[PDB]
UniProtKB/Swiss-Prot annotation, chain A:
This is DNA-directed RNA polymerase II subunit RPB2. Catalytic core component of RNA polymerase II (Pol II), a DNA-dependent RNA polymerase which synthesizes mRNA precursors and many functional non-coding RNAs using the four ribonucleoside triphosphates as substrates. Pol II-mediated transcription cycle proceeds through transcription initiation, transcription elongation and transcription termination stages. RNA-dependent RNA polymerase that catalyzes the extension of a non-coding RNA (ncRNA) at the 3'-end using the four ribonucleoside triphosphates as substrates. An internal ncRNA sequence near the 3'-end serves as a template in a single-round Pol II-mediated RNA polymerization reaction. May decrease the stability of ncRNAs that repress Pol II-mediated gene transcription. The gene is POLR2B. The chain holds residues 50 to 196 of 1174 of the full protein. It is found in: Nucleus. Belongs to the RNA polymerase beta chain family.
From Swiss-Prot, chain B:
The gene is GTF2F2. GO terms for biological process: positive regulation of transcription by RNA polymerase II; transcription by RNA polymerase II; transcription elongation by RNA polymerase II; transcription initiation at RNA polymerase II promoter. This is General transcription factor IIF subunit 2. GO terms for cellular component: microtubule cytoskeleton; nucleoplasm; nucleus; transcription factor TFIIF complex. Heterodimer of an alpha and a beta subunit. Interacts with HTATSF1 and GPBP1. Interacts with URI1. Interacts with GTF2B (via N-terminus); this interaction is inhibited in presence of GTF2F1. Keywords: Acetylation, DNA-binding, Nucleus, Phosphoprotein, Transcription, Transcription regulation. Its main location: nucleus. GO terms for molecular function: DNA binding; RNA polymerase II general transcription initiation factor activity. It comes from Homo sapiens (Human). DNA binds at G77, H79. It comes from the Eukaryota.
Curated annotation (Swiss-Prot), chain C:
It is linked to Trichothiodystrophy 6, non-photosensitive: A form of trichothiodystrophy, a disease characterized by sulfur-deficient brittle hair and multisystem variable abnormalities. The spectrum of clinical features varies from mild disease with only hair involvement to severe disease with cutaneous, neurologic and profound developmental defects. Ichthyosis, intellectual and developmental disabilities, decreased fertility, abnormal characteristics at birth, ocular abnormalities, short stature, and infections are common manifestations. The chain holds residues 75 to 146 of 291 of the full protein. Recruits TFIIH to the initiation complex and stimulates the RNA polymerase II C-terminal domain kinase and DNA-dependent ATPase activities of TFIIH. Both TFIIH and TFIIE are required for promoter clearance by RNA polymerase. It comes from Homo sapiens (Human). The gene is GTF2E2. Coiled coil: none annotated. This is Transcription initiation factor IIE subunit beta. Residues 1-72 bind DNA.
From Swiss-Prot, chain H:
Found in a ternary complex with TATA box-bound TBP. Part of a TFIID-containing RNA polymerase II pre-initiation complex (PIC) that is composed of TBP and at least GTF2A1, GTF2A2, GTF2E1, GTF2E2, GTF2F1, GTF2H2, GTF2H3, GTF2H4, GTF2H5, GTF2B, TCEA1, ERCC2, ERCC3, TAF1, TAF2, TAF3, TAF4, TAF5, TAF6, TAF7, TAF8, TAF9, TAF10, TAF11, TAF12 and TAF13. Associates with TFIID-TFIIA (DA complex) to form TFIID-TFIIA-TFIIB (DAB complex), which is then recognized by RNA polymerase II (Pol II). Found in a RNA polymerase II initiation complex. General transcription factor that plays a role in transcription initiation by RNA polymerase II (Pol II). Involved in the pre-initiation complex (PIC) formation and Pol II recruitment at promoter DNA. Together with the TATA box-bound TBP forms the core initiation complex and provides a bridge between TBP and the Pol II-TFIIF complex. Released from the PIC early following the onset of transcription during the initiation and elongation transition and reassociates with TBP during the next transcription cycle. Associates with chromatin to core promoter-specific regions. It is an enzyme of class 2 (transferase). GO terms for cellular component: cell division site; chromosome; germinal vesicle; kinetochore; nuclear body; nucleoplasm; nucleus; protein-DNA complex. Its EC number is 2.3.1.48. Disulfide bonds: none annotated.
C-alpha cells in the first residue's frame, strides 16, 4: 500500500484543470509527481521534529503517523505566450499511519539489542497501527 | 514547507496591480453612456452592472445614479435580471 | 440613432428648464454640437420613426410636450 | 513650579496638520487647470494637492471646500499658511473664505541625550506600552490624561504624536521624563 | 500607439505650417488636412519608441509643477543636460509629459 | 543629430502617408512641394474678511513667460518626489533646450521645489 | 481477503479525491477574482491524516455504515492472543 | 482576525511564532496581521509578554538539524549578547539568527547564511549585520565547554 499503491492513486488522478472565468483569460494546470514519505515524526509544542518512537506514542497517546509529501507542478499558460513551469517541490499533504515493524517504521531494520534500547519487545510481531495510543489491528 | 514570507507573492502582485488605478474612479461624460448601448444592446438587451462597468471606466454608484435616469432593471427577464432601457 | 436618443435626453433637460417652447431640430443639433448634412436627413428618417412612437412627445409643429400629466 | 530643576529638553515641534473650510463648494478640475504649483489625479486621491514654499508647507484642497494643510513648524505659521492657501484659491477666481480654522494634530520630536532600555519599561508600565520589535523598532506609549501617543526609541529620542495645543504636548515630555529616567542605561 | 503630445514639436509645427498654406491654395482637398497629422502621429511614434537607442541625464531646479488630468508639466530651470557639455543654463525648461 | 533623424522620419512618414493622400491622389510632386516645404521652412476669527490686508501672501515667483520654447515633449514612466527633491524616470525625450533641439530615449535627474 | 493494503487504499482514493476537490474550489475562488493562488495554501492537510486516523480508530470504512468492526484494539492477554488477533478473518454475513 | 488570534494564542502559551510564520500559513499579509494583533490587544484589554531570543531557539536549530550542543551554545550566546547590550534595539529573531550562525560556523555541523535566514525569518543582510555586531566579543560570548571544529580564531568574518 505504501510503496506501490499511494503513488498509483496519486499519479492516476486527472490533472486539475482550471481556467479563469472572470481575451483567453489565464489557464492553470496542476499535476502530481512522485510521493515522498518520511519517518514517523513528532512535533512538540515548540515545533521541533523529533523521531516518535512507538513506546512513546503508546505512553503519550499519540498516533504513529508519517508525513506524506508529493511533488506538484504548476503551469501558467496565458495569453498564448510561454508557460511558467515552477515545480513547487515536496509539499506536505498529510500523515499516513505506519504499521509497526513495517519497512517504513523506525523499527524495521533494528536488531534485538536496538529494540531493547528503544524499549520494545523483540518478540512483538508487528502489524498493528498506533492510533491515539491504542493499538489497532485491521481484521481481514 | 510552509516558509516565512513578508507577504505572499500573489497578494503582492494584486497590490502592485492596484498601484495602477482606483476603483473609486472619476467621471465627466454623462452623454457618453448611451453611445455604446446604442450599438451593443443587440448583444444584451439588458446589460449587467458588471457589463457596463468595464466598457465604461466609472465607479459603480455614479453609473447606477445615471442608470436610474436612463433605463430600468429587468427584474424578471428571459435571459436574466438586469438593466433594460427606455427607448428614449 | 444613439445621438437621437441623446437629443431626447437633451429635450428632457429642456423640460427640466421649464422654458419649453415650440422648437425644431436644427437649433438643438447646433446647441448639442452637431452638424446639418445628409446625416441629419437619415437621422431625421429615424426621428420620424421616433415620431411614430414618441412617448416622449416629438410632434412636427408646435410640440415636445412630453408629460401625459403636466400642470404647474 | 517645575517638577524637575533641569525641567527637561522641552521637545521642539516638527509637523502640524490644520483643517480649514473654504466656505463654499469649489470645483477642482478648474483649480487644477489654473493652479501653478499643484498635482491632481482622481485616481491617486480625491483632492488637489498643492504646496506653497513661504513656510515650506504642503496642503490639500477638497472639492467640498474643506481643506487641510500640513508641514508647518509654528502653529501660528500653520494657521496663516492655511489661510494663504485660501488666498490663491480665491485669486484664481473662486469664492474662498476662512470659516472654522482649527489645528487637529501636531507632532513633537525630542531627545533625552541618554540611551534607554525598553524591556523594563514595558514590563512595569505594561498597561500602556506595546513593543513588538518585528513590527516596528520603538515603544508605543499611550498616556491617558495628556492624550499623547509617544514613540520611545532606544537612542533616547522620543516623538510625541497626537497634540491638541502646544502646552498639552509640552506637559507630556516632563510627564514621562521621571518614568523614562529610571529605565535607562 | 500614436501620441497627440507631438502637436507642438518643431518637426510637427513645420509640417503643420506647410499643410496650412498649401491647402489654402487647394493643392489638395480640404478634408485631408487634419487626417495627415493624425496618421503622422503613429509614424513618429514607432520610430520614437523603438528606433531611438540612447538617453542622457540632467540637473537643475523648478519653479512650479503641474499634474493636470494626465499632463506632467514642469517649470524647471534645469541648468544642465550633460552628456558632454550642455553647460549653457537652460533657463525655463518646460518639461511636458503624458502617459 | 536632429537631421540625422529627419533623414529617416519625414521620409518614412511620407512613405506611409502615400496611400493616405492617395485616397484623393492629387499629383505626387505637387504634394512633394509641401512635403519639402516642411524643410524649406525648417531650414477663524469673526473679523476674517481681510484675506488680503495687503495680501496673505502673493506668489513672489512670477514668470508667466514660457521663455525658452523647449516643450520637452517626453512621455513619463514615473516621477517620484522626495522631501523637496524630485526624481525622474522620463522617456522619449524630445526638447528644444536653450533653442537647441535634441531628442533622446530616456532621462533622469533631480530637482528642487 | 482484503487484509490491510487494499482496505486503506480505498480510503486513500477517496481522500485524495476530496483533497483535489478542495484545492479546485480554493484555487478557483482565487483565479476568478484575478489573483494567482498559492498552492501550499490550498492543500487542506487535515483531509488525508484525519480520514485515515478516524477510520482506523473507530473502525467504519467510508458510506461509513458500509463496514463496521474492521479495526479492533489488539488483545494483550497472552502472546497467543495477540498472535491470533493479527491473523484473523471475518465473514461478511450481511 | 483568526491569524491574529492564532499569533496571540501561540504567544500566550510560551511557544512564540514570528509574524512571518503566521503569514506563511495564512492568506493575510504581515502588515495586516500586525494591525489586527494590536487591535485585538487594545480591544480585549490584555497583554502578551516579550518575545525573547530563547523562545525562538529549539525550533530554528532543530529544523536546521543542528545537534543539541550547537543549540545550547546558540541560546547561551544570544542570552549573553542581549545581556551585554551588544545588540541595541534590534529584533529578537535577528540576534537569534546571528547566534545560530555563530554556533553553527563554530561547530561540526555548520550552516550557510542563506539557509539560516531562509528557515528562521530573516534576510541575509540582517544576519550579517547582527553577526558583525556580536563578532568582536567572540570568545567571551560562548559557553565554557565547547569543541570548536574551527577554533574561535577563524570564526568566519562577514
Amino acid at each position: 500500500f505504501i510503496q506501490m499503491s499511494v503513488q498509483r492513486i496519486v499519479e492516476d488522478a486527472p490533472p486539475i484543470d482550471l481556467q479563469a472565468e472572470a481575451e483567453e483569460p489565464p489557464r492553470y494546470l496542476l499535476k502530481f509527481e512522485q510521493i515522498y514519505l518520511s519517518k514517523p515524526t513528532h512535533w512538540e509544542r515548540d515545533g521541533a521534529p523529533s523521531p516518535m518512537m512507538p513506546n512513546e506514542a503508546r505512553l503519550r497517546n499519540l498516533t504513529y503517523s508519517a508525513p506524506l509529501y508529493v511533488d506538484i507542478t504548476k503551469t501558467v499558460i496565458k495569453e498564448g505566450e510561454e508557460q511558467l513551469q515552477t515545480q513547487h517541490q515536496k509539499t506536505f499533504i498529510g500523515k499516513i499511519p505506519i504499521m509497526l515493524r513495517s519497512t517504513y517504521c523506525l523499527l524495521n531494520g533494528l536488531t534485538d539489542r536496538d529494540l531493547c534500547e528503544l524499549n520494545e519487545c523483540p518478540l512483538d510481531p508487528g502489524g498493528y497501527f498506533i492510533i491515539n495510543g491504542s493499538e489497532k489491528v485491521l481484521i481481514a | 514547507t510552509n516558509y516565512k514570507p513578508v507577504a505572499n507573492h500573489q497578494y503582492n502582485i494584486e497590490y502592485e496591480r492596484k498601484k495602477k488605478e482606483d476603483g473609486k474612479r472619476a467621471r465627466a461624460d454623462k452623454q457618453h453612456v448611451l453611445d455604446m448601448l446604442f450599438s451593443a444592446f443587440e448583444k444584451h438587451q439588458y446589460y449587467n452592472l458588471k457589463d457596463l462597468v468595464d466598457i465604461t471606466k466609472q465607479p459603480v454608484v455614479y453609473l447606477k445614479e445615471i442608470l436610474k435616469e436612463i433605463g430600468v432593471q429587468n427584474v424578471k427577464g428571459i435571459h436574466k435580471n438586469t438593466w433594460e432601457l427606455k427607448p428614449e | 440613432f444613439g445621438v437621437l436618443a441623446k437629443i431626447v435626453n437633451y429635450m428632457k433637460t429642456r423640460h427640466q428648464r421649464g422654458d419649453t417652447h415650440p422648437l425644431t431640430l436644427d437649433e438643438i443639433l447646433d446647441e448639442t454640437q452637431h452638424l446639418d448634412i445628409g446625416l441629419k436627413q437619415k437621422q431625421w428618417l429615424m426621428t420620424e420613426a421616433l415620431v411614430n412612437n414618441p412617448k416622449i412627445e416629438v410632434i412636427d409643429g408646435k410640440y415636445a410636450f412630453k408629460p401625459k400629466y403636466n400642470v404647474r | 513650579t517645575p517638577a524637575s530643576e533641569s525641567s527637561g529638553i522641552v521637545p521642539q515641534l516638527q509637523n502640524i496638520v490644520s483643517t480649514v473650510n473654504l466656505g463654499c463648494k469649489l470645483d477642482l478640475k478648474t483649480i487644477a487647470l489654473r493652479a501653478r504649483n499643484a498635482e491632481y489625479n482622481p485616481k491617486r486621491f480625491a483632492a488637489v494637492i498643492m504646496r506653497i514654499r513661504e513656510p515650506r508647507t504642503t496642503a490639500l484642497i477638497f472639492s467640498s471646500g474643506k481643506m487641510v494643510c500640513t508641514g508647518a513648524k509654528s502653529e501660528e505659521q500653520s494657521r496663516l499658511a492655511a489661510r494663504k492657501y485660501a488666498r490663491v484659491v480665491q485669486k484664481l477666481g473662486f469664492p474662498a473664505k476662512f470659516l472654522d480654522f482649527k489645528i487637529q494634530n501636531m507632532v513633537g520630536s525630542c531627545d533625552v541625550k541618554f540611551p534607554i532600555r525598553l524591556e523594563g519599561l514595558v514590563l512595569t508600565h505594561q498597561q500602556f506600552s506595546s513593543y513588538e520589535p518585528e513590527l516596528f523598532p520603538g515603544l508605543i506609549y499611550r498616556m491617558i490624561k495628556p492624550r499623547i501617543v509617544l514613540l520611545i526609541f532606544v537612542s533616547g529620542k522620543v516623538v510625541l504624536t497626537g497634540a491638541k495645543v502646544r502646552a498639552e504636548i509640552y506637559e507630556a515630555f516632563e510627564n514621562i521624563y521621571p518614568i523614562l529616567k529610571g529605565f535607562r542605561k | 500607439m500614436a501620441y497627440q503630445l507631438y502637436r507642438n514639436t518643431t518637426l510637427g509645427n513645420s509640417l503643420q505650417e506647410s499643410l496650412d498654406e498649401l491647402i489654402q491654395s487647394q493643392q489638395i482637398t480640404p478634408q485631408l488636412a487634419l487626417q495627415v497629422l493624425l496618421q503622422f502621429d503613429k509614424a513618429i511614434n514607432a520610430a520614437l519608441a523603438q528606433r531611438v537607442r540612447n538617453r542622457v541625464n540632467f540637473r537643475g531646479s523648478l519653479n512650479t509643477y503641474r499634474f493636470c488630468d494626465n499632463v506632467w508639466t514642469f517649470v524647471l530651470n534645469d541648468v544642465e543636460f550633460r552628456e558632454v557639455t550642455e553647460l549653457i543654463k537652460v533657463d525655463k525648461v518646460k518639461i511636458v509629459a503624458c502617459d | 543629430t536632429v537631421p540625422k533623424l529627419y533623414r529617416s522620419v519625414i521620409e518614412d512618414v511620407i512613405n506611409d502617408v502615400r496611400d493616405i493622400f492617395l485616397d484623393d491622389g492629387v499629383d505626387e510632386q505637387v504634394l512633394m512641394e509641401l512635403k519639402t516645404l516642411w524643410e524649406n521652412k525648417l531650414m477663524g476669527q469673526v473679523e476674517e474678511e481681510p484675506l488680503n490686508s495687503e495680501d496673505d501672501v502673493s506668489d513672489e515667483e512670477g514668470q508667466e513667460l514660457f521663455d525658452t520654447e523647449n516643450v520637452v515633449v517626453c512621455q513619463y514612466d514615473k516621477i517620484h518626489r522626495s522631501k523637496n527633491k524630485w526624481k525622474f524616470h522620463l522617456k522619449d525625450g524630445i526638447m528644444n533646450l536653450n533653442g537647441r533641439d535634441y531628442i533622446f530615449s530616456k532621462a533622469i535627474g533631480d530637482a528642487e521645489w | 481477503l482484503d487484509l490491510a493494503g487494499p482496505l486503506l487504499a480505498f480510503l486513500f482514493r477517496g481522500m485524495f479525491k476530496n483533497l483535489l476537490k478542495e484545492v479546485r474550489i480554493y484555487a478557483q475562488k482565487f483565479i476568478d477574482r484575478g489573483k494567482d493562488f498559492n498552492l501550499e495554501l490550498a492543500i487542506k492537510t487535515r483531509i488525508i491524516s484525519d480520514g485515515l486516523k478516524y477510520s482506523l480508530a473507530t473502525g467504519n470504512w467510508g458510506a461509513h455504515q458500509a463496514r463496521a468492526g474492521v479495526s479492533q484494539v489488539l488483545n494483550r492477554l497472552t502472546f497467543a492472543s495477540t498472535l491470533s488477533h493479527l491473523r484473523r478473518l471475518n465473514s461478511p454475513i450481511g | 482576525i483568526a491569524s491574529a488570534c492564532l499569533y496571540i494564542a501561540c504567544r500566550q502559551e510560551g511557544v512564540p511564532r514570528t509574524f512571518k510564520e503566521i503569514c506563511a500559513v495564512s492568506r493575510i499579509s504581515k502588515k495586516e496581521i500586525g494591525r489586527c494583533f494590536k487591535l485585538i490587544l487594545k480591544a480585549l484589554e490584555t497583554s502578551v509578554d516579550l518575545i525573547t531570543t530563547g523562545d525562538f531557539m529549539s525550533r530554528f536549530c532543530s529544523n536546521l538539524c543542528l545537534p543539541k550542543q550547537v543549540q545550547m551554545a546558540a541560546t547561551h550566546i544570544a542570552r549573553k549578547a542581549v545581556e551585554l547590550d551588544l545588540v541595541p534595539g534590534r529584533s529578537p529573531i535577528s540576534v537569534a539568527a546571528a547566534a545560530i550562525y555563530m554556533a553553527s560556523q563554530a561547530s561540526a555541523e555548520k550552516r550557510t547564511q542563506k539557509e539560516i535566514g531562509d528557515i528562521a525569518g530573516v534576510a541575509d543582510v540582517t544576519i550579517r549585520q547582527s553577526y558583525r555586531l556580536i563578532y568582536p566579543r567572540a570568545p567571551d560570548l560562548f559557553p565554557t565547554d565547547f569543541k570548536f571544529d574551527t577554533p574561535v580564531d577563524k570564526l568566519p568574518q562577514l
